[PDB]
Every structure is written in C-alpha cells, then in structure tokens.
Amino acid sequence: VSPPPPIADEPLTVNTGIYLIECYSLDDKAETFKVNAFLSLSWKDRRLAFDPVRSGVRVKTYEPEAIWIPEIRFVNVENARDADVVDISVSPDGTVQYLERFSARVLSPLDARRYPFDSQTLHIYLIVRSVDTRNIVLAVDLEKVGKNDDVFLTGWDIESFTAVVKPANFALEDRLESKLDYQLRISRQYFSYIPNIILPMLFILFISWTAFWSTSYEANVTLVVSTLIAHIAFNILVETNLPKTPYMTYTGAIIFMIYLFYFVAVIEVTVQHYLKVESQPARAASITRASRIAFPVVFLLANIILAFLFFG
Amino acid sequence: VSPPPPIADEPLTVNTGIYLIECYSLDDKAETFKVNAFLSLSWKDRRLAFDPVRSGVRVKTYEPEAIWIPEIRFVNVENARDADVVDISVSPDGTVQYLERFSARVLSPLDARRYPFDSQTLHIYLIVRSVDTRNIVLAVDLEKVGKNDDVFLTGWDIESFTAVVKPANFALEDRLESKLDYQLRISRQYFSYIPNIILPMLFILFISWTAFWSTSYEANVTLVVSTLIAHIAFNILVETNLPKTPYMTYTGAIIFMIYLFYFVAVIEVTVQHYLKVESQPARAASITRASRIAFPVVFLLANIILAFLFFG
Amino acid sequence: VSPPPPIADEPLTVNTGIYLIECYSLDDKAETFKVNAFLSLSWKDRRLAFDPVRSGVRVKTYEPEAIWIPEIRFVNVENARDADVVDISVSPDGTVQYLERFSARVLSPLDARRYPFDSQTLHIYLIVRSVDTRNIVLAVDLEKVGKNDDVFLTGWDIESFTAVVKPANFALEDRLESKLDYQLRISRQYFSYIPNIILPMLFILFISWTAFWSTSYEANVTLVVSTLIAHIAFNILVETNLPKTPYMTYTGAIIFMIYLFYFVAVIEVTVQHYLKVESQPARAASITRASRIAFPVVFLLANIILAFLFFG
Amino acid sequence: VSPPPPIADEPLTVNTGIYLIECYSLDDKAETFKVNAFLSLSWKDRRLAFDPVRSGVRVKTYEPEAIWIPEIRFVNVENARDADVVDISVSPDGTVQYLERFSARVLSPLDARRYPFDSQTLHIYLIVRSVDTRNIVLAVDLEKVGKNDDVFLTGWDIESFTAVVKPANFALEDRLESKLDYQLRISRQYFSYIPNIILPMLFILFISWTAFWSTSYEANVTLVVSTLIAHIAFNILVETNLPKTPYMTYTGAIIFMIYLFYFVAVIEVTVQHYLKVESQPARAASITRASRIAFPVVFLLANIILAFLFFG
Amino acid sequence: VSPPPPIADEPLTVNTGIYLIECYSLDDKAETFKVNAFLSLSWKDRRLAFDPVRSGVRVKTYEPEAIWIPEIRFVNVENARDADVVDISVSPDGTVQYLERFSARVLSPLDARRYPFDSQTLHIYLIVRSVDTRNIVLAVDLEKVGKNDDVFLTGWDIESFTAVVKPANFALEDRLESKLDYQLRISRQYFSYIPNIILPMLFILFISWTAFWSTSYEANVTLVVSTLIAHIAFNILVETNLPKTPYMTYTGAIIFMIYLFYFVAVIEVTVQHYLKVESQPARAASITRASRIAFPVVFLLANIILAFLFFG
Ligand SMILES: [Cl-]
Ligand SMILES: [Cl-]
Ligand SMILES: [Cl-]
Ligand SMILES: [Cl-]
Ligand SMILES: [Cl-]
C-alpha cells in the first residue's frame, strides 16, 4: 500500500520481460498493430520476509490488492492496456514475482520508400514514474524475453524480438522517468508481386510500343490511347496493394515514368503523321526506325538509374 | 480458495468438453472467425464431500466464488473470452461439474492455394497453467464434445468437430503447461463459381481469338485491345471473390496465363500486318492459318498441365 | 434465491411475451439483424403470498435481487443480450410479473433465390434450462405479443409478428430444455428496381442488336465490343444492390444469359464477314435477315422459360 | 426510494428540457444520427422540505442514490443512453432540480424524394411509465430548451429546435405512458452540386448530340457509344453522393431520361444510315435536320414537366 | 467531499495544463481526430494543511476519493473521456497537485478551400461549472503546456501547441461557466501531389490537344472522346485523395475547367469538319490554326486568374 523505503538512499530496481504470444492487424496506412503478450516484473521488498521453517511453506501467494505494485505504463498506445493478473509469488528473502497477460494497440511509424523490399522495426516503449518517497528504475531480464513459435504476420517474416538493455532516464513534470525499448524486426515477402503487378503493366506498355511498326494513323492512335486506358484500369485494379504515403516510393516512380513514356509515344505518332502529310516520307521513316530502338533502351537505362538511386 | 492438496503426489485431472452452438464472421483475409459455445469442466475435490442421507439432498449447488476453480485460458484468441457461469454442482463423492457459455474471436491461419476447391481445418487451443502446490493436466470427455445442427457458415460445408485426446505438456517460464487441440473441418462450396467467374472470361478470350479469320489491321487491333480492356474491367468486377494472399493460387495463375495469351495475340497480329505490307501474303496466310489451330490447343495443354501441377 | 419447490411433482410454467419496439441493421450478406424490444415473464411462487388487508396494499414491489428469477437465454444471438429490469410486481396469490427492455443481434439465414420478389421469415428462439430440483417449461401469452406501429425496415414491408404456441422439449447435456420460436414475416419492395437495373441493361443489349442492319465489319465490331464494355461497366455500377450468395439467383441467370447472347452476336458478325469475303453475299444476307428475327424471339422465349422455372 | 404519495388523487408532473450541445454522424442510408445534450428534470416532493433558517442554508445537495428519481427513457434509440449526473438540488418548498449529460444514437426516417433541395425534421421521443402507486405525466419547460451556437452538421443548415408542448398519453401493457416529441429542422446545402454533378453530364450528352451534323456512319457510332461509356463511368464516379433509396427521386428520373435519350439517338443514327444505303438521301437529310431541332426541345420540355411534377 | 468555503467572497482558481503525448486518426470527412495526453490541475484548499515537522514528511498522498476534486469536462467531444488518476499530492500550505492520463475523440471543423496548400487550427475546449456554494474559474499554467517530440500526423507538419490565457465566462442554465481554448496548428505536406495528380491529367489534356494538327474527322473524334474517357478513369483512380466537401475548392475548379475545355475541343472539331464538308477549306484551316495558339494561352490565363482568386 506504500512504496518500500530504501536502506539509505538506493533506488528500487524492477526487472522486466515480455513474452510475445500473438500479433495481428498490422495497418500500413494507420501505422498501427495489435499485440497480446505476457508481462513479467520482479523487485525486492523486505517487508514481506518470512521464515520457511516456521511457516512450513517455501512460496507464498498474495492478492493483487493489499500489496504495493509499481505502476508500469506503455507510451505509444492508443488506450490503456487490458490486463488481468496471473500469479503473484514472494520468496523468503522478499523477492516478488509478478505475471500478467495484456492486450494493447501500438502506434509505430513505418517507412515504405522501398515498398516491395522494405524492412521495418516495430517499437514498444515501457515507462515508469518515480514517487516522492523513492526513485524507481527499470532493468531487462534476458531470460523472460521471447516469442512463441506460432507468431505470424500475413505477408511478413518475423526475424527477431530483442530489447535495449540500457534504459533512458529523464525528467518530466518535475519527476524522474525511466524508459525501455522493445524492438521487433520484420521483412516483407515480395513474391507474387512480380506476376500480379509488374508483368501485366509491362505487357500493356509493350503492346503500346507496337505502333512503331505501322504507318496507319488511325491504328496507331487507337493502339496508344486504348493502351493508356487499359493501364489506368489496371492501376485501379491493383491500387489496393500499393502503399498510400505522402512521399514518393519506388513503384510510384515507375508508374510516373510509364505515364511519361505514354505521352512521348503519342507525341512521336503525331510527329510521324504530320511529317508524312507534308510529303516527306524519308524523315518519318528515319524517325520511326530510330524510335524502334530508342524507346526500350531508354526505358532500361532509366529503370537501372532509378534502382541505383533508391537502393544505393 | 486454495488448490486441493494431493493424496501423496498425484496430479489433478480436469476433463474438458466443448459443445458448438454458433459460428460466424469467417474472414479469409484476416484469418479470423467468431465462436459461441459451451465449456464443460469436471474435477475431483474431496474437501466438498457430504452425506446425502444426513443432508437430505443428492446434489448441492455453489456460487462461482467461495470455491476453487481451475484457470483455463485460450491461446489463439484476440482478447479474453466473455463468459458467464451457468451451473456448478457437486456430488457426495466430491466431483464438481462446471458449465459456462462464452464468446470469443479465434486466430487460425488458412491455406487457399486451391481456392475454388480448398479444405480447411480450424484450430482452437486450450491451455492450463500449474500452480506451485499442485500440477494440473487436461483430459477430453468424448460425451461432452459436439455441435448443434443449426451451425452454418455461408459458402462452406461443416464436416466434423473432434478433439485430439492426447494433451501436449511443456514448460514455459519455469512452469508446466498442458494444451489441448480442438479441430473443425470445413469444405468450400464451389458451385456458382463457374457461371459467375470462369465462363465470361473464356467468352471474352474467345471473342478476342476471332481476329485470326480477318485480314483487316484496324479491325484486329480494335478487337484485341478492346477485349483486353473488357478483361481488365471484368477482373475489377469480380476481384471481391478472388483470394488476396501473398502466394500464388490456381485462379491467379490462370489469369496470368490469359494476360500472356493477349500479349502473344497482339504480337501475332502485328507480325501478320507487317508481312502483308512487305508484299509477302503467302507467309502471312500460313501464319494466321497455323495460329487458328495453335492457340486453343496450347491453351488446353497449358491448363491441363497447370491443373496437374496444383492438384497432383 | 432458490427455485420454488413443487406441490407434489408438477413442473413450473413461465408465460412469455415479446413486444417489438425497433428493428434495424438488416445485413443480407451476414444474415444478421438488430432488435430492441420488451420481455415479459410471469410465473407462480406461493412463498411470496401476503394478506392485502393486513399489509394495506394490493401490489408489492421487489428488487431484482433477493428474488428467484428463471434464467432465460436466447439461442441464435452473437452475444448475451444487454438488458435492464423495469418492473417486478407480486400479487397476493403469489403471481410474479417481470418486465425488462433488452437489445440483441440475431443470426437468421436468408434465402434470396428470387431476389427481386422474395419473402423472408426471421426467427428468434427462446430457451430455458431446468434445474436439478424443479423442471421448467415455457408458454406463450398471446396478449403480450405485438409490435409498435413505428417499426420500419428500409426496403421491406413488415407483415406480421406471431409466435408458435407449442414449445419444443428436448434433452441436452443430461438436462431438459424447452424452446419457443418467434417469427417475423417481411416482404421486399421491388419498385425502382426496373428503371434502375433492368431497363438500362436491355437498352444496351438492344443497341448491340443494331449490327444486324449493317454490312460494315468495322462498325459492327465496334458496336458489339463497345456494348460489351458498357454492359460490364453497368454491372460494376449496380453490383452494390445485387445479392452476393453462393447459389444461383434469377438476376444472375439473366446476366449470364446476356453474356451468352453477346458471345453469339460476335460469332454471327464474324460468320457474316467471312461469308462476304468468300464472294457469297446471298448466304450472308440470308443469315443476317434470319438473325434479325431469331435473336429477340429466342431472348423472349428463354426469359419466359427461366421465369417459369424459378417461380413455378 | 419510493414514489411520493399524492395529496388526494393528483398526478405527478415532471418538467423537461433538452439543451443541444453537439450533433454528428448523420447517416442517410441508415437513417441515424448521434446526439450529445443536457437533460433537465424538475418535480415536487414535499418529503424533502426543510427550514432555511434552522438549517442555515438555502439549497441542499443530494446523491443520485437515496433519492427517488423518475425513470425517463428514449423510444427511438438503438441502445440505452450513456449518461452521468451533474447536479441534484432541492428547494425548501421541496422542488427538486435534476441535470445530466448524455449521449445517444437516434433512429429517424428520412424522405429524399427531392434530393438536392430536400428539408428534414428529426424527431426525439421522450417517454415515462407510471407506477402502481402514482401516475406520472410530462411537461415542457420552454426556458430549458435550446441549442449551442457551435452546433453544425456537414452539408446542412440548422434552422430551429423546438418541442411539442402537448404530451401524448396512452396505455401499453396495462400501464399509462406519456410521450413528448422534440423536433430539429434542417435544410440541405445544394451548392457545388451543379458544377460537380449536373454540368459534366449535360456536356457529355451535348457531345453525343453532335452526330446530327455528320453523315459518316463510323464516326456517329463511335461518338454515341463512347459517350454512353463515358456517361456510365461518370455515374460510377459520382454515385457516392447520390441517394440510395428504394423509391424514385428527381436525380434518378433525370438519369433514366438521359439513358432513354441515348437509346433514341442510337436508333436515329441507325435509321439514317439504313435510309442512306437504300439510295434515298432526301429522307435521311430531312430526318437528321428534324432531329437537330427535335432533341433539345424535347429534352427541355421533359425536364420542365418533371420539375413541375416533383416540386408541384 | 464538499467544496472549500471561501475566506469572504473570493472565487476558487484552478490552474490547468495539457501535455500532448500522441495524436492519431485525423478524419477529414468526419472532421474528427483522436488525442492522448496528460491533464494537470492545481488549486488551494486550507482544510488539508499540516505541519511538516510534526508529521515528519513534506508531501502527503491521497486517494482519488475522500478528497474534493473539481469537475472538469470537455465540450467538443463525442463521449466522456476515458481517464485514470496518476498522482495526487498536497503541500503543507494546502496546495493540491492533480495529474491524470486520458484519451478522447474531438470534433473540430476544417476548411479545405485551398486543399493542396491549406493550414488548420484544431481546438480543444475545457469548461468547468460553478456550484451553489462557491464560484470556480480557470487559469493556464504555461509551464505545464507542451507536446512530446514523437508526436506525428501522417501527411501533416505540427507547428505549435499553445493556449489562450484568457478564459471565457458566461451563464448557462442559471449557472456560471468558464471556458479555456487549446489550439494546435498544422500544415499539409503538398509534395508528391504534383507527380501523382497534376501531371498525368495535364498529359491527357495535351494528348487531346493534338487533334489540331490533323484533318481526319475519325482520328480527331477518336482522340478527343477516348481522352475524355481516360480523364474520367483517372479521376476515379485519384478520387480517394481529393477532398469531399459541400463547397468548391481549388482542385475541383481546375477539374471543372478541364471538362469545359474538353467540350469546347469537341465543338471545334465538329465545326472544322462541317466547314470542310461545305467546300470551304480556307475557313477551316484558319480556324484550326487559330485554335492551335488559342487553347494553351486561354488555359494558362484562366489558371492564373483562378490561382489569384483563391490565394489572393
Ligand atoms: Cl498501459
Ligand atoms: Cl480466454
Ligand atoms: Cl441472452
Ligand atoms: Cl434511454
Ligand atoms: Cl470529458
């Protein structure tokens, strides 16, 4: 009911540990994900010391009330966690073991500049606030940190779940606070992205490029404009997978380049027809023959430059 | 209020049983489903023994409090179950019967590689944690496991609801735990998928294939490109039924093959026109006559190979 | 606090009644709807008998606690009902009157084979579980069953709200249970469906049919394929009203027939052009003249047959 | 804890008042809106009379419990209101003043026949149920009814918030009930509807009408069918603003008329081409010259008639 | 449990302060956003005075109950805040320090007339209600107002978070109330808007403008109408980013201007063809040569005028 007084001036150390159980509902647009895990705490309080021989037992059990419990809170959460106590055990020396299961929704920013091949690090921050009588710090128990083998995120590969052992101590509202950081590393599964997104767009663009082997104005106009319409329709079809961010990504740059290429192809067709009308067929033939080689080479070079820029 | 002490060293056995009442909200993308069922527990505690003759009654009733109840928890759930106690009865020998009704949301992965003709097995995991004084194990009561005849899932056929009798015992956080597995088998109803998805796409492709009986460049270009646009529009229309997974499925492979066939048809039309312009009509006629037979046969062979690959 | 003991062996009868207040959120895809109504119960318990002359009052009032209340539960509900007690009154003879207001979400399957002109019957099931001391049955009070005149469902006409007087008694988990069924009959308002769905589709099909009065291959190809694209676009526009079921309905069959007709029209145009190219104009003229009559008559006959099949 | 007994037979009068604070989430399809306001009640109970001189105070304060409070409920609400008591004050004469803040979701039907220029009246119904000892009626306190100046609804203009002073008394379940009606009048802001919905559709139709100045069958077919496709696409684009009701509205009638006009234009183009093929150019020229004037005049006349029908 | 009586007539002053922690879920259409912050209160109550020497402690701690706490409420919130007390400390002089953490959903109107380059000011209103015994006012503690460095809003730049020091006092329901205003200033990140929205639309319009260099009626009709279809499709693709408001914005005006330009281009093409048919080629050549210059210059001038109108 009251914090344990220090011996002379020493602070109170609380050892923490989080065991991951389930993770779900990773929202890329809202930058949120849900968690469900165990929380373990351990501190020392000599007011609970007892003689095992006299009592006849080795470990005693206590109610969540009638016992002082440090106030641990999460920083980057939408609401307070929904938790229920599992076990509270005390040792003859006075060491208290605390265990509980909780659920929470976490806010963590994401960076999707390299959307198909990005890696992210989700953060969970644990903080404690000191009281007027005693100062409290936080520590990491490396044997209580882990994850279940059934943890899965759709479309992601879970790599590791560690914690930074060194806490961060700072003052807030004229009170000392200590903060710990838990990190979960994930990587995106980029397969099925090629045959579902990349290849059909390239097929439509290559179909549009066939206008360089024809001299009929009507057929070329139909081909190019209808392929533009088909490209827009495919973009509408696949927009649900593309990231929706206020900054430019790799795929968005590729799509913008495709739009620019469509515009340039329209210009080339118009120029060829106008030159043909003016009774100068040699210039038009030279221009279309040059374009036949120029377009794919420029496309490849621009793609290589963009890939080096984004991943270099 | 305290676990029942053992006679000498024997563990405490709890017999479990789940009677399914309702199932709803099966989300394929989120891999979740909701449940509503009865939970039955039965253990032995000799501290509650009584004489039926002296008491004048055969079965006694107790409040949920003032009685020790084992702590049973679900593993693959988003939040803790919402449950309410129904009946607690004790026998003169000391056997306690526990019954309750609960609702929960379960997380279970799904495999939709053969989307139209897939079968799934949903899992519900039941776990218990031992205490410092006594060790607790779990058992299955085969007469308390079943489902109501009104249980239904839209678009699925419910086949069976059984449980694995052998529990899994392991250590976690220096404590013994026992786990049971309940399995529900379902199969998808694949009718109305043909006339709503498969046939219109084949009709559009067959319409596109009519360009092999004509020698007009403008008409062929219009036919092929407009059929491509129609195919993309139909894909947009029916995307709500197709599975959205990070891996390739049967229908996705079929759709990709259709895209490739459209591209090849465009190439064939362009080649025929270019050969005709060069004053070589015999080669163009031979090529289009060959394509007339080549396209459907190759389509059929590729479909057969794909079907053998996915279902073999 | 305890069930009322019987005189010798008679069971306890509970008279029930539901007065509908509001209904809302009818989901066709999820087969759910929300309700808000009054629940009325009435049984007999002689332990509460009193003398009106001695007490000076005719009707006494009791708290929800300190009084035995039968446990009534709904079967086809997602969660337990959210209810609050309104009045508890006792008669000198010992008859107890119970009233409460509750809200719940009900699961009831729907059949939409005749989507525009279907009628449905929503079911609410009420059950009670017997105790070890006394057996309880259910009865219907016909004067406590009704609905408010302000009850409305968007797009539906409410016809009646009755209850089956005969309960169903069966054993479950070695315990007797009694079940009552409440039925609400509704019919769909099919107006505004014609001018918003049926007529534009027929207009597009009739526009496509104009190709039988022309001999230009390019114009016919453009007409038919562009009308196919327009049909797909209109289907995308109006898909939000069409039912999404795993079985075939009337409108879906009509749409599939329209797709088949488009395919056949494409085939006819191709055949006419090919015959014209082969320098056989008489056969092509005969074929197109025959098609001019054949197409609408076959459409009408097929529609009549389909209507007889679905509504016969 | 008990209702105040009457002097001889008079009923108990409760004066009510609602002060609007916020309104939000007006759903046209679901016919629902959310509210947040103050509730004020005032009745007379002589059991609380006290002498201000002896007590030394003028106004006393009471807890929500240990005091009889009339049970006020809302009729057209999805669930029970979420309310918290603010102040309870009593006068030496015995008059009690009650104040609370609540939030609720209201169900109120809407009529959108004249969608762009419609006005609605939202209703909130307040009811009370009499007890066996005393009968209770409701009254309106005109000085406690009002709204905050910051109340706003997106796309609507708030006009007034009054209440019908006369209550409605009727019997339900053999008990007397009194009902009050609170009305909120709103009107829709119809600007930005013209340049975002009306004008582009008219532009597309006028573009389609240019086919009457040309004699080329291919160009006319392309123009009309492509404009039909564009009209359907624009309808898909703007469907999110159009009302979704089971009855016909003004805008829906306009759209249906536009569809009919497209069909008639197709028929005219076909007739002109067929007459031209039959070597009768004078008839075709006369028909197209007549159509040039006939189409816009008929469109204007039909629009005027429709406007008079809907708003007359 | 009772408000502190004044010395003679002075009011009670409460010093407030809000420290922002997290902000998320900014809905432009619903004009709502979620918050999570600390609330700090400080007042004076001499009934809690104590001697530090006699007590042996400097700061005492109290439970949230058994102590009078002023009732602070938010005005523009959907529901009551979800808060939990953190610390309650008292000074020997009697000054009480109050701290709590809360979460809430705020309603604040937004103005998006200059959608790409708009700035907004979100408001949070704090109010208190006086009691019959004592009058309470509000004050701002400038050292308790701030925000965390990790506060982020997707697509926005956070600039400042201040408060108006002067409260607003007014009477409501015959009671005095004091209101404080907290303001958060944000600005929108307008990058990636150009290459994702503006440039493709201009490319499509420029493609449509190429019809002024050709004299073929069929090609011009195809170009213009197909570009109109592509523009509508792109609008459908990008509608998710455009604001949905009942008033006109900058981007909406630009889009309407583009529609008008498409209509005028159609008219020009029709006029040119009709003049050519009438055997007057010089007039048609002059008109198209004039249009070649007229269209882009008028577009630029109109854009400049619109930009000056909206941002001037
Ligand atoms: Cl927390
Ligand atoms: Cl659980
Ligand atoms: Cl229930
Ligand atoms: Cl209520
Ligand atoms: Cl609040």
Residue numbers in the entry:
A (entry chain A), B (entry chain B), C (entry chain C), D (entry chain D), E (entry chain E): 5 to 316
Pull text from the paper:
Gloeobacter violaceus proton-gated ion channel (GLIC), a prokaryotic model of pLGICs, is particularly well-suited to stabilize preactive states under suboptimal activating conditions modulated by pH. The GLIC homomer consists of five subunits, each with an ECD and TMD. GLIC is activated by the protonation of a series of titratable residues in the ECD, leading to counterclockwise rotation and contraction of the ECD. Therefore, we established a data processing strategy involving symmetry expansion, backtracking particles, supervised particle reorientation, and 3D reconstruction to resolve high-resolution maps of various asymmetric intermediate states of nanodisc-reconstituted GLIC at pH 4.0, which provide comprehensive understanding of activation mechanism of GLIC.
